Symmetry: C7
Subunit: 139 residues, 7 copies
């Protein structure tokens, strides 16, 4: 492959999705989450030179964050909070970039992964009412 | 063309505004906000070698901040606080420059965007009583 | 001119003043302020190779600060606290230099400007009992 | 040898395990632990160019962490908390990498080892219900 | 001159004094101060290649500090706390050097000057029971 | 010698020990200590290219720490806590390395030495039930 | 001649001492102090290539510290706490070296000197039951 797949974390209780394109790398990503359930519910992604917004999950959270990524801007730090198991969920995401930008979405009360780093090219996982999530990098 | 448009965040309300100058960049930017409503209400911009103030929104807030930007000075840090959805609003702004200058206006209690960075060229959105909606605009 | 004029912030009131000297920069600046009114009241300036003290405003404040500036020393950070509107005032000033010197005068409870930076050449505004209005002036 | 062996710390108990491959260095490692027992209970490891998960221990902890390691990324900081002696246990691990990444699992209430550093090639020890014992293994 | 004169701050009272020598620069300086009155009371200075101690003021303070200055060591930070006006006093001093030495004497409850910096060549002012007034003097 | 001997600190009691190997430096060192007596009780050392464990003192403490030292890794910071006098003891050790590793064993409630630094080659002292006395030994 | 004498601080009492070696420098220095009296009581010094201990004062303190100094290692920061006047005493010492080593002895409740810096060559002063007085001595 021309890609590196981060471990997808939390569970199998959703519906599979893969957002990647030759169109290029991620230019913006949004996380929607709730104080009520302390979960990620909904993610949206836009790629370089492509105005289609690829969404998954139910946008029912009372909070969202957007990170915008310059074309030459990499992820140098990355943490996903989650509930472990087969009935697992993604609870939170923390990203830090080569340009000193960072975002913090949701909660981090149980399990954590510190992922591979590099140029963010896509996301894979499963979502229904809630977000499983794995990041995808270049080389 | 020459420009990177940050996502306009906030609601669909307000009177539209697009303040940009060809071969010009922002030299000063003012945010007006209220403790009462925890909203941005009014913004003004000046461009390089031009004393005319491009204003939008109702200057009814009890606080304002100005950032002045040297001609060679870029935005390296940029956050807009807002309320999401169709009846959304801009609540706050945080900017930091390549020369270590920063400003903070308003509140950050719901949604955040961490925008593109670079040389600030314009702003676009909608405003009436409030800043309903705001997107920053950079060069490349 | 060979000069950059920072936004004058504060009200329209007071008697106008402009302290500048042809190719000679500020080497000392004093701010006088009160706890009672939380305002700047009085400012003095001295220029390079000139022993005249240029003053404005009523020195009725219970506090003063002086910054002295080496000939090769620039302002890298600069904030003026003020009350906005026609009935406005300067409440405070914060300066930081290329040599890690800083001063803090007065209060910052309402509005702020983060100004242009560079070599401080002069100041302009209006004052009577109070500093109604203040803007800094720099070189290139 | 091609390899540097950290001291195995903890007890003599559990079923012995060695996770190493001629086909690669470690690309991912997971620690599972409990607040209830203040122990490590379960570990999993994957190597470069090999899709098998090598697991040991009972995944009965209420917490897990995963660290993923870029191919060119080394361990610069490394600490294992444990209870000493024959009936000992591993209680905690702290890892920090050449790329500023770190993870922290479990507790550090008794004994500590600060290990050799370098490229992590695998782990050795014993586990049953808990991680009785752990030793890290590096290249040169 | 080949000298830079920092503003003398404090009152106009006290016996006048000038401690400078062509013999050379300040090698040691002492400040004496009181908790009771929150004032500087007494100063002593020694120069390079000169064994005289030049003293002024009444050594009635319950605290003293000495800074000793290597021949090649400059002042990079300098603050004098004082009470402004005719009946003013020096209350405090903070010095920091090119070698990361600093001293702190006395109190800072009213007015401040952040002085010119450089090689400390002497001091002038007025003292009696108190240091009513102080101004530093530097080289070029 | 090709060796620098740190001062042995502690009492004159216990059985004497010297752990050194010709052209072989310390690769691992363990300290054992008790909360009950706030003393070091037992130390073990291993050298480069040699699988023997050289121990001294009674391993009766409820805590141990191990430091492993990469072949090219030096001590840049070093403290031994002790009780002074003829019936003195070692209470604690604090080491920091050229690779940012640091360890802390035992207690620091009485006397301290900040030792020579460099490549740790050996240790000398005395021990019985306790570590009576300890001195580090370095290369050049 | 070859030497810089720091100001001796403290009182006039005690038995005089001057510990200096031609073509030598201090390799170890010990301070003894008491919580009871908050004074330094006793000091010992060893010089390069010489095993003899030069002592002064009564070792009656409940605490001691030793600093060991590599032959190429200087003092970059140095502070002596003391009680001023004829019946004065040394209360405390803080030393920091060109290798980031530091020690702290005793108390700093009254007066301070920040001394000259450089290569520590000797000490001079007076002591009986206490260190009445101490001055450091450096190389040119
Ligand atoms: O930026 C936010 C918003 O700005 C604009 O909409 C703001 C504002 O628009 C209208 O103006 C306010 C007044 O509208 C009418 O005159 C009337 O509805 C007024 O109601 C007042 O007076 C009546 C009668 O006495 C009272 O019954 C009421 O209680 C009020 O005291 C309004 O004050 C209104 O539609 C108002 O509701 C609205 O906030 C637009 O640009 C919009 O797109 C922006 O989102
Ligand atoms: O990593 C820790 C440990 O892992 C392994 O040993 C784990 C545990 O394995 C055994 O499991 C526990 C039970 O074993 C026996 O079936 C029985 O003794 C159980 O006890 C319950 O039931 C009996 C019968 O009614 C009663 O006697 C009891 O009161 C209990 O209600 C045990 O708990 C044992 O081998 C146990 O001691 C051991 O810790 C090994 O890999 C070991 O090497 C590691 O230390
Ligand atoms: O560095 C400090 C100090 O050290 C030296 O001073 C020590 C001490 O020297 C003298 O000796 C102390 C004793 O003096 C007399 O023998 C006697 O007066 C002793 O007092 C105890 O017992 C008497 C009689 O029982 C009682 O009257 C007392 O209350 C005591 O219980 C003293 O302890 C004295 O000159 C004393 O004042 C002095 O400090 C010198 O180096 C000195 O220069 C230094 O300042
Ligand atoms: O400059 C230091 C100090 O010098 C002078 O000292 C003040 C003393 O000077 C005079 O002797 C008087 O002002 C004296 O006043 C005390 O006794 C007085 C009776 O003579 C009485 O009326 C006063 O209330 C007071 O008890 C001062 O002590 C002078 O220049 C000072 O103001 C100056 O600070
Ligand atoms: O800076 C404040 C103002 O200075 C002048 O007048 C104001 C003053 O009038 C009276 O002399 C006093 O009682 C004051 O209390 C009062 O501020 C003018 O120059 C004015 O317009 C300025 O705003
Ligand atoms: O290493 C410290 C000392 O260890 C032993 O002394 C400990 C105890 O030994 C016996 O229990 C009694 O003598 C006790 O009084 C004593 O504390 C000896 O090895 C001694 O030499 C060591 O200094
Ligand atoms: O979020 C978990 C979720 O699982 C799927 O997405 C659906 O089957 C939901 O109705 C259930 O509520
Ligand atoms: O310094 C306090 C006091 O001292 C005396 C005289 O020198 C006065 O002039 C002064 O007010």
């Amino acid at each position: 492959d021309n890609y590196i797949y981060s471990t997808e974390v939390g569970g199998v209780g959703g519906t599979p999705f893969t957002f990647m394109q030759e169109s290029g790398t991620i230019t913006s990503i949004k996380f929607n989450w709730s104080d009520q359930y302390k979960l990620l519910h909904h993610i949206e992604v836009k790629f370089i030179n492509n105005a289609n917004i690829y969404a998954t999950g139910d946008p029912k959270g009372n909070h969202e964050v957007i990170l915008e990524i310059d074309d030459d801007e990499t992820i140098i730090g990355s943490v996903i909070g989650y509930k472990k198991g087969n009935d697992g969920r993604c609870t939170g995401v923390k990203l830090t970039t080569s340009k000193g930008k960072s975002i913090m979405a949701g909660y981090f009360e149980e399990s954590l992964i510190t992922t591979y780093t590099g140029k963010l090219a896509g996301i894979k996982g499963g979502a229904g009412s809630d977000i499983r999530l794995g990041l995808i990098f270049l080389k």
